[PDB]
């Protein structure tokens, strides 16, 4: 009873170190790292049995049901997503606040954030959550609009600690012109915001979808065909050029194209502040899973897929996301990018829609709506995969154990520490720093042990996910390690297959400005922004 | 085409002339509009032997979306037309002009500043990507950016049908001639320029073109 | 008290974290990190006053006077180098063991290491030191060559914990063929050794020196001219190709060429195990210093060709290999340090006097009329002193002046990666309770208005605490210096003073690097017999 919790006999993994040592936790925070800590000094003692202790994962790309229903109805609330996150070793999620176009003036974007904060305040939260802001309506022309937009970002930051802005170069109603992106970059750079881009050429996708439908090529598999990797490559290149002109740090979300990874690498080599996120599904899955008839997952081992269920022609919708899961031979480039520094972070792009109920507004079968002139075409299939729970274990197994990542230190860097640094949650989150870190920690099972753990799962199942979805894309696959303990702010919220709801105390997270998103102060011409 | 042929038929011509067609209004959506546009190119070819079409990715009233370009590429490929592009990112140019004018940076020299070589580089790259998806031979007009020449060279190395045109002024002139005081011309030997006539603040307009004459 | 040493009120920087916390030290090791530690629990308490605490620097490219005198006479013994290292925040140095060709059999390379360890065991050492092995004589043909060399490497590892091998693609008497390098790579890969290459095309250098001398172009400045960046680029490219064919992890030492950085980056992007080391002089100096904020203001350096135009031989102070490059190259070095191209930063510390002309360890050794030497660049001993200034120069010009992204990057390349790549991890390179040797540096506060009479404003020779009579960075402004250097729990340097009584450095046996295990990737179906 000097410390709430002591973790003994474990191996601490950080972004830069692996070593055997012990941890004391008290008042929600890491207090102490030492070789040995007297177990009489703690209220609760955990014997890690030689296993890795990692910081909690931070998943900065999670989509939850929100009041404006931008992505239509999604099955997971913040309650569900944080419960699922925690069962998979993720201890901080960042979801998305949709700009509300009905609200005007200086407080317009703060008010948009307020909708989500208020909605989630009534729910039981298993871990902390933050919010990104989604921007899709930019006032024109540029100069005349600058005063208000800048004033609007300040207010979203000052009131709610939102310090990142997400924009789209694709999707009808979300896609914005290069002109408008420049206007946004002007405001974000001035405010030290993290600028995030979904880089696909929207015009190309639109044209090719119409070309495919005209031929009757509407099955789920043609979603990938509608937007090949070169489309993501072009848009990324264009977005880099805009960021260079505007001297604005930029993060690319869910990157899955080799050509995009290439232009991203070249910019980074040049020293430009270009960051990138990728997702497990782009390393583990290929587009053959979207229709019937070693580096990643043996696709034949996945249950309830086009392989196992050839009769069900709509079952490919389970693996439909944006950007799409890529053809065979692309997935090696993803791991390579994770190891060689191209991918700063790894997120899940968690977005959940049911498959085994066909009725609800949050179903995949929402694509079938005869009245609304919808007949199951890939166009009308809600995009997304559940992934918040399996993100960490999939990297641990297929990344670390199977040799696709160089070390556990690289795993922690991309899954935990870099997400905290890039989204302004550092040092509070992302590491194991005495007197500084929120005690957000994961204790795994031992790897080399002959001991039996009846609670350690052999396979991924839907029940294991602890979510509100009725399917997981990785159903039936072998998983070689799982969180044994997930500790959130000093409390055990997950132990050996069980969620401990009484210890759920997650809160909205106000974030700071990232130190990685200060500008290089490098310019293409003599032009400088007025405020310089 | 008939408007131009008829106008020039009355003039004294010292040599032969042909015509390119300039396209800036494309019907949408693409599928519905296809047979007409293909039918219209055939008619321009059959009646007048016009076999090349020029499009702009910049300039208000001329700039066209990527969606529209793909529509045109669909028609030009089918008809064996020569497809020509002016590749500058129109949105970037527009935004940067407004930014410069707000600072009062309006002199002829700031024309170059409003559209640095990286803008031509981006647009060329985008146009190549469009051509690749559409398997359509493409020619880039008046190329003056190193970044554009690089992406054009990579495509040609891959064996893609990407052609390019440049102009003497991009080899011989640098943008110092656009404001008052090598492998090209000694700029001090040019007469009636900002160098010889520093008082005339508008004389830089003599060397204003698109894409601009580039830095040394 | 229960701890020997408590460091309070400081900011801990590691390769991945920056945070305010306190450290307890006991029995030569880090024992504890906590928010606050009761000062009554320690025998000695240091108030860091808001300053950064870094792990001690590890300099894995230091040349000291050795019995075989491969580099001729060098002015610094291991005593002098470690003294100088410590005054500049470096707490582990790795020097070079020269292969002794008079020894044969299974123990031949262990015996070569033994000569150095025995020589240095009589000296006062201010910090720990390890040894690389230098290889320049490889037996032929290959199949024998690779196979007796394997038994010899095992012996040097087992006897003395030598786990790295250095080879040259240039210099007469050191240069080896590609065929011989392949033989070595065969042996090093099999033994998990760290393989190091000096990559310059020796044939090109040789031909160009002869061409320059023929025209009488012999002054110090023509050393750079004799070996342009393209020569380092070609050799590095060749070395990578050899590494790829042999699936052998490879480290390039003192990289200074953009072309070499380019090919190194390409390989890393492909995922090949190619590592690189650069040096401060390649980021801070340009070749204009050899005759008469991103870089050092060259006009602020004292006792150079600018200040002393009459002294025609003073350019020799800045002669090294590879050469200091022309203006415009130095920005690509910082970029490489930031973007992941350079895994580590070393000094290439190699000291020869300038202000005495008579000794075998002078630069003026280039003037030997009776030995047909008349001051030609060819005959100038190559090297600069740099072991002391390495850390401060990176702190100032790197971190404070914005050329490096953060303190975390500084620590990564100066401390933690050198440990990892040369098998000294985790004993060395970080701040890990119950694991790390308590090798630590406490700097001065950056934003303070308080005055520190002991904090130097300029680099001088006296500050270096070495046996050389000059430093190339003489006279330049330096914005921070180690305030305390702690080696194995003991203060060996405090506020300008070396505390000799606390000198307890030892030879360091090293392990196999975890970074130097093979990728298991091949160009063809061929595999080594032992696979
Ligand atoms: Zn997206
Ligand atoms: Zn998303
Ligand atoms: Zn034009
Ligand atoms: Zn060397
Ligand atoms: Zn050396």
From Swiss-Prot, chain C:
<comment type="subunit">
    <text>Homotetramer.</text>
</comment>
<dbReference type="InterPro" id="IPR006680">
    <property type="entry name" value="Amidohydro-rel"/>
</dbReference>
<feature type="binding site">
    <location>
        <position position="382"/>
    </location>
    <ligand>
        <name>substrate</name>
    </ligand>
</feature>
<feature type="binding site" description="via carbamate group">
    <location>
        <position position="166"/>
    </location>
    <ligand>
        <name>Zn(2+) 1</name>
    </ligand>
</feature>
<feature type="binding site">
    <location>
        <position position="198"/>
    </location>
    <ligand>
        <name>Zn(2+) 2</name>
    </ligand>
</feature>
<dbReference type="GO" id="GO:0005737">
    <property type="term" value="C:cytoplasm"/>
</dbReference>
<keyword id="KW-0862">Zinc</keyword>
<dbReference type="InterPro" id="IPR032466">
    <property type="entry name" value="Metal_Hydrolase"/>
</dbReference>
<feature type="binding site">
    <location>
        <position position="348"/>
    </location>
    <ligand>
        <name>Zn(2+) 1</name>
    </ligand>
</feature>
<dbReference type="Pfam" id="PF01979">
    <property type="entry name" value="Amidohydro_1"/>
</dbReference>
<keyword id="KW-0479">Metal-binding</keyword>
<feature type="binding site">
    <location>
        <position position="254"/>
    </location>
    <ligand>
        <name>Zn(2+) 2</name>
    </ligand>
</feature>
<feature type="binding site">
    <location>
        <position position="321"/>
    </location>
    <ligand>
        <name>substrate</name>
    </ligand>
</feature>
<dbReference type="GO" id="GO:0046872">
    <property type="term" value="F:metal ion binding"/>
</dbReference>
<comment type="similarity">
    <text>Belongs to the metallo-dependent hydrolases superfamily. Hydantoinase/dihydropyrimidinase family.</text>
</comment>
<feature type="binding site" description="via carbamate group">
    <location>
        <position position="166"/>
    </location>
    <ligand>
        <name>Zn(2+) 2</name>
    </ligand>
</feature>
<protein>
    <recommendedName>
        <fullName>Dihydropyrimidinase</fullName>
        <ecNumber>3.5.2.2</ecNumber>
    </recommendedName>
</protein>
<dbReference type="GO" id="GO:0004157">
    <property type="term" value="F:dihydropyrimidinase activity"/>
</dbReference>
<dbReference type="InterPro" id="IPR050378">
    <property type="entry name" value="Metallo-dep_Hydrolases_sf"/>
</dbReference>
<feature type="modified residue" description="N6-carboxylysine">
    <location>
        <position position="166"/>
    </location>
</feature>
<dbReference type="InterPro" id="IPR011059">
    <property type="entry name" value="Metal-dep_hydrolase_composite"/>
</dbReference>
<feature type="binding site">
    <location>
        <position position="63"/>
    </location>
    <ligand>
        <name>Zn(2+) 1</name>
    </ligand>
</feature>
<feature type="binding site">
    <location>
        <position position="171"/>
    </location>
    <ligand>
        <name>substrate</name>
    </ligand>
</feature>
<feature type="binding site">
    <location>
        <position position="61"/>
    </location>
    <ligand>
        <name>Zn(2+) 1</name>
    </ligand>
</feature>
<dbReference type="InterPro" id="IPR011778">
    <property type="entry name" value="Hydantoinase/dihydroPyrase"/>
</dbReference>
<comment type="function">
    <text>Catalyzes the second step of the reductive pyrimidine degradation, the reversible hydrolytic ring opening of dihydropyrimidines. Can catalyze the ring opening of 5,6-dihydrouracil to N-carbamyl-alanine and of 5,6-dihydrothymine to N-carbamyl-amino isobutyrate.</text>
</comment>
<keyword id="KW-0378">Hydrolase</keyword>
